[PDB]
Amino acid sequence: SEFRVYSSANNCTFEYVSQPFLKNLREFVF
């Protein structure tokens, strides 16, 4: 309900936005 682990980000170099990913089986390959 709050934010975490991605705190104190000195500087950040990349951002991209897409449409959302997620009785339903969800397969991914990386």
Using rule CB under 8 A, residue 14 touches another protein: yes
Q: How far apart are the C-alpha atoms of 22 and 4, rounded to whole Å?
A: 21
DSSP 10: S
Using rule CB under 8 A, residue 17 touches another protein: no
Which residue of 13, 18, 19, 24 would you call a contact of another protein, by CB under 8 A?
13
Largest Cα separation within the chain, whole Å, is: 41
Between residues 11 and 24, which has the closer beta carbon with respect to another protein? Answer: 11
- Count of positions on this chain that bind ligand NAG (CB under 6 A): 4
